[PDB]
Structure 1
Amino acid sequence: AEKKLEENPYDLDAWSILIREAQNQPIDKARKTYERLVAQFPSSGRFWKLYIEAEIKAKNYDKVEKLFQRCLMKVLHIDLWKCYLSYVRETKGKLPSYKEKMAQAYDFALDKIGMEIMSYQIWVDYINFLKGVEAVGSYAENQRITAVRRVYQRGCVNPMINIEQLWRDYNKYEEGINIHLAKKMIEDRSRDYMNARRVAKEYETVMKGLDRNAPSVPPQPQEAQQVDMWKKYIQWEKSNPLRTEDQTLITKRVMFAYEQCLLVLGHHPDIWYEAAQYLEQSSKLLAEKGDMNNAKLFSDEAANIYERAISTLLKKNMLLYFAYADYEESRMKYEKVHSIYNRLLAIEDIDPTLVYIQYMKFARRAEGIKSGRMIFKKAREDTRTRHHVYVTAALMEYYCSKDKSVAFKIFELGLKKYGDIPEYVLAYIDYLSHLNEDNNTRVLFERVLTSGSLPPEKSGEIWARFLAFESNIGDLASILKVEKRRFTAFKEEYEGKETALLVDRYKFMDLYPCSASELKALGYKDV
C-alpha cells in the first residue's frame, strides 16, 4: 500500500488499505496511520470522524477534545457536528452545569451547520433537551415555554428534509399548552413557513446529485463532471431562490454553499477564487446601500477565505496569493501586501521568477519607481530566479518611467548573466526591433550570434527574427549574405529544405506565396 502511495500520494485505494488495517491494530499504533491521513486530508470530515471514533473507543477523552479544537471550525461536515454533540452528551453528562454546557453546544452548531439539509435531528435533540431541563414554579415553566418556542420559530424558516414534521410538532406544542391561542400563533408565522417549505423542495434537486463525502483531490472524466454540479449549486444559490434584496441573507447562503464545496474540492483554486470575489462583489454592493459596518465585515472575510487557501490546503499554489495580494491593494492596505508576497518567497521550492514580476508590478504601481527597483534588487539576489524578471523590469522602466537608458542597462545586465537562454534574448530582440534604429537592432543581432554566449543549436528563432528585420530595412545585398551565412550555421538540418526556408524571406503574417497543400511537401514549418 505504501508503494502505491509513492506514485499517487492521494491513491484512495492505497489510503483505504491503511484504513482497513487501522482497526486491526491498537490505538497507539493506529494513531500514526490516522495522523498521516487527517493531516493529508484536512477537509474530509468522514476521515476526521473515524479517528475521533477510534479515540472514543480507547476512552481517551482528553485527546478527543483536542481533535474538536483542531478540525471542527475548518470542517463543516454534518456527521462531524453530530459526533461533536454525541461527545458532550456522553462525557459532560454527569456535570452539575451540564444543562448550561449542553444547551450552549446545540446553539453553537445550529448557527454554523443548522442550515444543512440533514440537520433536522440537530434541531429535535435540543427541543427534547429543553423539555428535559427541570423547571419548578410558573415563571421557570414560562422560561421553558419561551426557550422551546424560539427554536421552533427559527427552525421553521430553514430549508431541510423533515420541515413538514417540525411544523407538525409545532402545531401540537401550541395546542399542547393552550388550544385557544394556538389558532393565532400557528397562523401568524404560517405564510413564511410556506415559503420555507417550498424552497426546501427546491433545495432537494441540486443536493441529491452531489456526493458531499469525497476527499479533496487536485484535478488530474468524473472529477470535472463533479465540478459542474458544484458550479450549478453555486450559481443557483446566486440566482437567489429566496428572492430578497437583503445582500447579507443572500451572501451568507452563498458562503454556506462555498464552505460545503471547499470540503470536497478544496485543492481547486477557482472555488477559492470565486468565493472571495463574491465577497469583494458583496463588499461594494453593501457599501452602496447604507450597511457600512457590514461592508468591512465581508471585506475582511474576503481576506479570510483567501487566507484559508494559502495556509491550510494550497500553500505552493501561486494564484491564490496574487488574488490575495491584489485584493489588499484594492483595500489600500499596502503594508500588509509586502507580508503576503514575502510569505510566498519564504517557501522553498517555488519559482519566484513569476512572483518577483508581480511583486515588482505592485511596487511601481502603488509606491513609485524607486520602490520598484528595491524589489528588483531583491530579485537579483535570489538564486531561484530565472530570466523573466529581467525582461519585465526593463519594460517597467520604459513603459512607465519613460526612460530608454535604464531600460537598456537592465537588459544589458541580464544579457551578461543570462545570455544562453533563447527565450530571454527574443524578448530583448523584439524590444530593440521596435525602438526605430536599424543601427541599434542589427548590432545586437551580431552580438548574440557571434560571441558564443548563446548556443548556436538553440538559436533558430534568433535567426528567424533576423530576416524579419532585414526584410523591412536594409538592402537585398544584406539579405543574401545572411541566408548564405544562416544556412552555413545550420548546414546539418537545412539541406533539402532551402525553398521551404525561402518562404520566411517572403511571408507576411498569414500571406504565403504558395498554397498550404504545396508547403506541406516542401518541408515548411511555422515557428
Structure 2
Amino acid sequence: TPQEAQQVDMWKKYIQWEKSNPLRTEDQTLITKRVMFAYEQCLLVLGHHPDIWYEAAQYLEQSSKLLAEKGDMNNAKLFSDEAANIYERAISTLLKKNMLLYFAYADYEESRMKYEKVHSIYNRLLAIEDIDPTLVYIQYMKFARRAEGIKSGRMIFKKAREDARTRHHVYVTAALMEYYCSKDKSVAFKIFELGLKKYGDIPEYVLAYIDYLSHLNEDNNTRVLFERVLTSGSLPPEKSGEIWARFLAFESNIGDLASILKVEKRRFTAFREEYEGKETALLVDRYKFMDLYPCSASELKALGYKDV
C-alpha cells in the first residue's frame, strides 16, 4: 500500500536522523542505544518487514565493530551478542519462515565462528514442514563445505537428497561444487548422472547439466549427452524447445551445415504442430547470436517469432 510506504519512510528517515548523532556526542554506546530504541519503536508497528530487522541487526554489527576498533571490548561483545538476539526475535515471532533472515542470521553466527550455532539455525528452518528447503539446503551446503570442508558439505547434500521436498537444484549445486571446489570431473559427472535419473523431465535441470558438460569442450561427449537427454523418452517434446536450440547452436559452433540442418529437422519434427506454418520463425534461431537478429523487430513479429 502507498500509505505504508510513507510510514516506512518516516521511520527510516527518523532512524537516519538518530544515526546522525543529534546529541553531537562521542559516546558511541549511547548513540547506538538511542538508535536501537528507535528501531524498537519501529519494530512495534513494522515487525513484519524483513528489512527493518535486518538493518537493525546490521547496525549493532557495525556498532560493535567501532567500539572494538576504539579499544572498548566490553561493549563490543554486548552489541555483538545483541545483534544475534535481533535475528532470534525476528525468526522467533513475526517472521518465523523468512528464509532471508534465517540466512542472514546463519551468516552472522558463521562470521563469529559459532558453527554449531549455525547448524542449529539451518536445521531449525528445515524442521518447519511447510517450506521449500531446496534453497535452504544449498545455503547449508555452501556453509558446511566452506567452514568444515568437502566431507561436511557432502553430508548436507545427502541430507538433502533424502528429503522428499528437495528439488533438482540441489543436485546441480552439489555437482558443480565437486567440479569447482574439489576440481573433480569424475564426481561431478556422477552426481549429475544421478540427478538426471529423477529429473530427466525437467528442462532447467537438463539444461543445467548440458551446460556443465558443454564447457568441458569435448565435442563427442557433449553430443552424446545431447542425444541421451533428448532421445531417452524422459523429456517431453513440448519442453525440449531449448534443448533443441542449444543442440543446434552447439552443432553450429563446431559442426557442419549437414549437422545443423539435420538437427533443425529433428526439432521441426518434435514441433510439427507447434512451429507449423512458421518454419521461417524456427529459421531465425539458426542465425541469432546474443541479441543479434536476422530480421527487424516488426519484421520479426510478422513471422510470429518467439524466443526463450
Partner Cα separation in structure 2 for residue 441 and residue 261 of structure 1 = 56
Residue 363 of structure 1 and its aligned partner are, at CA, apart by 0.6
- State the distance in 2 between where 1:397 and 1:337 align: 23
CA RMSD of aligned residues (A): 1.1
Cα separation, 1, equivalents of 2:6 and 2:303: 44
Query: What residue in structure 2 maps to residue 135 of structure 1?
Result: none
Aligned to 2:274, the other structure's residue is in SS state helix
Unaligned runs of 5+ in 1: 1-220
> 283, 288, 312: which is aligned to 2:93?
312
* Deviation at residue 225 of structure 1 after TM alignment: 2.6
Mapped partners of 2:41, 2:307: distance in 1: 48
Shift of 1:510: 1.4
Q: CA separation in 2, counterparts of 1:252 and 1:478? A: 70
Counterpart in the other structure of 2:212: 431
Task: Spell out, residue by residue over 1:161-193, the C-alpha distance to the aligned partner (whole angstroms, 9 max, x if none).
Answer: xxxxxxxxxxxxxxxxxxxxxxxxxxxxxxxxx
- Write the distance in 2 (CA, Å) between the matches of 1:245 and 1:285: 12
Tell me, in whole angstroms, the C-alpha distance in 2 between the residues paired with 1:456 and 1:463. 10
SS in 2 for 1:449: helix
2:53 and 2:163 map into 1 onto residues whose CA distance is: 30
* C-alpha distance after superposition, 1:2-53 (max 9, x if no partner): xxxxxxxxxxxxxxxxxxxxxxxxxxxxxxxxxxxxxxxxxxxxxxxxxxxx
Q: Is the 8 A contact 2:21 2:31 kept in 1?
A: yes
Return the offset for 1:223.
1.9
Give me the whole-angstrom Cα distance separating, in 2, the residues matched to 1:452 and 1:233: 61
* Residues in 2 aligned to 1:455 and 1:526: alpha-carbon distance in whole angstroms: 19
Native 8 Å contact 2:90 2:101 kept in 1: yes
C-alpha deviations, 1:453-489, integer Å up to 9, x for none? 1122122122121122111111111011111110011
Whole-Å Cα distance in 1 between the matches of residues 128 and 30 of structure 2? 39
* Alpha-carbon contact 2:275-2:281 (below 8 Å) kept: no
**Aligned with 1:349: secondary structure?**
coil
Q: Which residue of 1 aligns with 2:28?
A: 247
Alpha-carbon displacement from aligned partner over 1:231-254 (angstroms, at most 9, x marks no partner)? 212222122222223221111111
Partners of 1:422 and 1:224 lie apart in 2 by 39
SS in 2 for 1:505: coil
Q: Give the match's secondary structure for 2:165.
A: coil
Give the match's secondary structure for 2:144: helix
TM-score if structure 1 supplies the norm length? 0.57
Q: Deviations over 1:47-87 (max 9, x none)?
A: xxxxxxxxxxxxxxxxxxxxxxxxxxxxxxxxxxxxxxxxx
Partner of 2:237: 456
**TM-score under structure 2 normalisation?**
0.97
Distance in 2 of aligned mates of 1:415 and 1:354: 19
Q: Separation in 1 of the partners of 2:205 and 2:150? A: 23
Deviation, 1:329, is 0.7
Deviation readout 1:231-287 (Å, 9 max, x if unpaired): 212222122222223221111111111111111111111111101011111121111
Displacement over 3 Å in runs of 4+:
none
> Could you tell which deviates more after superposition, 385-394 or 500-509?
500-509
Cα drift, residue 526 of structure 1: 2.2
Give the stretch that moved more between structures: 458-467 or 324-333. Answer: 458-467
1:109-124 matches, within 5 Å, as none
**Paired position in structure 1 for 2:58:** 277
Counterpart-to-counterpart distance in 2, 1:435 and 1:245: 58
* Paired position in structure 2 for 1:302: 83
The question of whether the paired residues in 1 share the 8 Å contact of 2:168 and 2:195 is answered with: yes
Distance in 2 between residues matched to 1:467 and 1:234, nearest whole Å = 56
The separation in 2 between residues aligned to 1:503 and 1:247, in whole angstroms, is: 64
Q: Deviations over 1:495-521 (max 9, x none)?
A: 122222212111111111222221121
Report which of the two structures shows the higher radius of gyration computed on alpha carbons: 1
Q: Deviations over 1:400-444 (max 9, x none)?
A: 111111111111110002111111111111111111111121111
- Secondary structure of the corresponding residue to residue 522 of structure 1: coil
**Aligned-pair identity (%):** 99
**Alpha-carbon separation, structure 1, partners of 2:194 and 2:76:** 47
